[PDB]
Amino acid sequence: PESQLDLRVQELIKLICNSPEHPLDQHYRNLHCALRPLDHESYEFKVISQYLQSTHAPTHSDYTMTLLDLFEVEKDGEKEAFREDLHNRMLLWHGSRMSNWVGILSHGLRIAPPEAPITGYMFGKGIYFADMSSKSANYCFASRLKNTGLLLLSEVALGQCNELLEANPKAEGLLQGKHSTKGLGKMAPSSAHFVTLNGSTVPLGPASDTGILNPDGYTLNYNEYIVYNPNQVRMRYLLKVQFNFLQLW
Template sequence: MKETGQKAEAVWSDYSQRCSTLLHSTRPFVFRDYQDLADHGAAAFETIRDINMASRLVGDMFGSTLDDPLSDRYKKLGCSVSALEKDSDDYKMIVKYLDTTYEPVRVGDIDYGVSVENIFSVEPSACPSLDEIKKLPNKVLLWCGTRSSNLLRHLQKGFLPSVCSLPVPGYMFGKAIVCSDAAAEAARYGFTSVERPEGFLVLAVASLGDQIIEVKSPPEDTKSLEEKKRGVKGLGKKKTDESEHFIWKDDIKVPCGRLIPSEHRDSPLEYNEYAVYDPKQTRIRFLVEVKYEEMGAELDTTEP
């Protein structure tokens, strides 16, 4: 937006009123920039969409006449979920990937680390099969941030592209499915609140296609990227050490490496982000249950 001063304020005020008309709220929010629009407009719309889907899936649990309503909802989910053994190779690989690419989430003046509670292998029927994914080129295992409110929809429907294009992280690639090689990026979305320290991180296999476009700033024409469905890599201020990357099963690359400064210090992205425009090129593979813990806090174990 080229307008500044009072003209800009008038435009943002108009956007805010339009959004309040579509998404009613007891506390209407006034947008002041694109980041506000992303955080409190686009993200809010996606959350309401996913909560609506989840509520339809769950329905009335208490009024059900089924002997086992929970099992019935699990079947409707259309996604097999099974816990990984903690001594399995996959479990150890994922914990290493998380520990290596994680940085504390900062909320206010407090830094939060994470500990892994459980890791689940998931097989969503809505996503391409593993055999289909195996045939695709440039496969990478990437972190995808999700709020707890979005989780059921991801498992039942798979990933959906972003609802809009905005020149800010998360939406700068247009209507794309965006993941990262840094668990630190996904952890920002997984954090819920201090009162609810549990969250989930998603690991997905994404095929970036035969040609990967690298960008250092928000693309000017996202529609052409959406039409051509090419993989895009947004270069962040930090990157994973490529010397530590390795190949996992089925020729899938795992960009597990220490986070180090990149040569792109002016990038709007903190970490590398990857955009895929075709849902058929992504498959949710693992669900990592984590607990956010205040760093440096000492627990008072004395009895009253």
């Protein structure tokens, strides 16, 4: 009964969880997901760390983020299922509750559940991504007590984007052959600062004005990216992040 995994992956499993194989060794083999830690000195960490800080959104001032540990993610089968034909391959942010990462790592990203939309989803039942690290980071629901969260970096086959200025629950019907919806925001990383990591575009910051205005009212502050098929997504990195908040009271 003794574990065979690296301590940093060991620490991750303890975080998302709770024989001749240790239970920590046992749960990972049941994720069916490679998670290989990267070195704090590595090119991949220096580049990904810079992505995280330069895309902390100006309106998300109640905290800052420190990157504790970085992991490389290769989900088996996801590489083959991947729409390699499609253009606009970007490395994009996805944040979620701690309680969701076993589900996310075991089964890949799923579309918005076919259950209760409530009123509906902002752009219908798809998978959501952001280009501002802190826009995605706010979806981890970290708190002063639970101040560790995860960010997912994924290659996203955007293909041809259906660009939208305002919200639309029926956005998926309007695709008519294009491959994803992009909600245009006042602010986003601009291509002048883009960089490449292992064959995927990295929308590096700082954010700038995008020149987008809704002539019919409110213009969203930041982009959102939505794909409606899990085969347009391929996880590549998983960030272990500590959220550093301000004075509570």
